[PDB]
Amino acid sequence: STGSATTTPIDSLDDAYITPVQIGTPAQTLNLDFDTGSSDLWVFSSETTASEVDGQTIYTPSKSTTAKLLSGATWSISYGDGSSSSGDVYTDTVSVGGLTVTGQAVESAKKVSSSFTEDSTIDGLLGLAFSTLNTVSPTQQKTFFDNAKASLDSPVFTADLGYHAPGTYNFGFIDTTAYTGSITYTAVSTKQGFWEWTSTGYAVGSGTFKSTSIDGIADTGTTLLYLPATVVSAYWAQVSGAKSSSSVGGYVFPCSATLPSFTFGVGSARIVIPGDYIDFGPISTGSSSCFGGIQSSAGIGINIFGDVALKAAFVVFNGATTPTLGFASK
Ligand SMILES: Cc1cc(NCc2cccnc2)nc(N)n1
Ligand SMILES: Cc1cc(NCc2cccnc2)nc(N)n1
Numbered sequence: 001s002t003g004s005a006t007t008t009p010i011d012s013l014d015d016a017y018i019t020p021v022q023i024g025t026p027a028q029t030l031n032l033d034f035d036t037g038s039s040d041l042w043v044f045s046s047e048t049t050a051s052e053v054d055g056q057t058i059y060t061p062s063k064s065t066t067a068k069l070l071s072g073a074t075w076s077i078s079y080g081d082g083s084s085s086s087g088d089v090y091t092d093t094v095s096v097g098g099l100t101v102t103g104q105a106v107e108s109a110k111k112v113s114s115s116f117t118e119d120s121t122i123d124g125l126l127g128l129a130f131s132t133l134n135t136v137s138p139t140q141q142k143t144f145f146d147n148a149k150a151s152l153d154s155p156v157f158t159a160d161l162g163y164h165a166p167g168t169y170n171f172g173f174i175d176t177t178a179y180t181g182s183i184t185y186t187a188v189s190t191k192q193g194f195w196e197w198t199s200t201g202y203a204v205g206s207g208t209f210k211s212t213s214i215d216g217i218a219d220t221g222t223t224l225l226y227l228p229a230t231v232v233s234a235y236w237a238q239v240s241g242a243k244s245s246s247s248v249g250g251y252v253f254p255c256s257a258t259l260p261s262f263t264f265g266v267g268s269a270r271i272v273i274p275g276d277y278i279d280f281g282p283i284s285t286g287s288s289s290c291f292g293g294i295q296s297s298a299g300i301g302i303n304i305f306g307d308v309a310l311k312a313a314f315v316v317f318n319g320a321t322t323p324t325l326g327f328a329s330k
């Protein structure tokens with residue numbers, strides 16, 4: 001089997017992306033944030049504290065003839081930024097782009113932090129990291145991809161995120177019309193539960209390529225590109241007036257600037273992020289200070305190839321017995 005679903009940015013600046021997912025019988029369609037950096041499928045629901053729901057579409061398990069309580073199971077997750085959610089668990093039928101999994105753990109939120117409440121366009125998350133990170137207790141649950149894997153034509157999914165435009169998540173096949181040239185595959189470590197790999201270096205604009213190993217994760221769930229402070233300083237040094245500011249907690253550049261591209265290495269291949277992709281717009285309405293899309297990872301503990309980087313490529317998440325990642329230009 002295969003599936004194919006369109007993923008759509010939530011606003012004009014690609015702050016996050018949403019993909020429609022069918023849950024239950026009859027289907028209840030919720031727009032979920034597909035997140036290769038986490039491993040829980042959780043939704044706003046009829047159980048969510050009412051004051052913490054503000055415009056989201058909710059899953060109501062009592063209206064699904066295929067829903068079943070997973071007795072005794074609870075979940076709780078903290079993301080790196082202070083965003084949190086928790087609740088109980090049902091199993092139900094879940095379909096993405098025509099690919100159906102029965103008995104999928106659907107984690108129903110009883111509580112969500114304010115950032116989730118305020119994101120009216122995001123009805124939940126669908127995790128696509130490794131199932132070892134799933135937070136359900138006392139019985140850890142599998143991701144949608146792990147449950148679908150054996151049925152798929154090939155044990156892969158692909159992320160093709162758009163710049164200021166919709167893109168595609170495919171399951172079970174590689175669309176050879178969706179990229180140019182060849183896909184370069186690179187080794188993955190699953191030791192931390194992430195799609196963790198090692199970039200071979202970087203270049204700033206038309207500058208020379210610096211060969212250096214950069215370990216990081218491919219995370220569709222992270223909006224920005226987070227890299228070592230040395231690399232980030234070298235990038236922003238090429239933008240007149242750019243600076244790291246403590247009020248905004250990161251690098252800002254003049255909204256009159258033209259940004260240089262940023263290239264990252266995948267083996268001997270190179271992925272070029274156009275300068276415009278590194279532009280996230282004014283820090284507040286009417287400001288002439290604009291938010292940079294490349295930021296330091298120094299406070300995180302890991303480098304993160306988030307959407308800024310991934311949207312410049314066609315990305316293969318290869319879930320074979322020994323997982324690998326593939327990147328192609330497009
Ligand atoms: C899921 C998610 C991410 C996101 N990232 C961008 C962002 C903007 C401002 C401050 N911090 C982050 N914006 C939203 N709306 N939801
Ligand atoms: C995948 C994901 C979503 C999310 N949503 C909360 C949120 C909303 C707005 C701005 N920043 C965060 N937070 C995180 N860390 N990961």
Ligand SMILES: Cc1cc(NCc2cccnc2)nc(N)n1
Nearest residue numbers: 254255256257279280281282290
């Ligand atoms: C995405 C974005 C928005 C922006 N807004 C500033 C602005 C205000 C008024 C007229 N022209 C520009 N400036 C830049 N560099 N990128």
Ligand SMILES: Cc1cc(NCc2cccnc2)nc(N)n1
Nearest residue numbers: 224248249250280282283291295
């Ligand atoms: C205007 C704005 C602020 C912001 N703040 C959160 C933040 C600070 C430092 C690094 N990463 C995230 N994030 C985004 N995307 N836009």
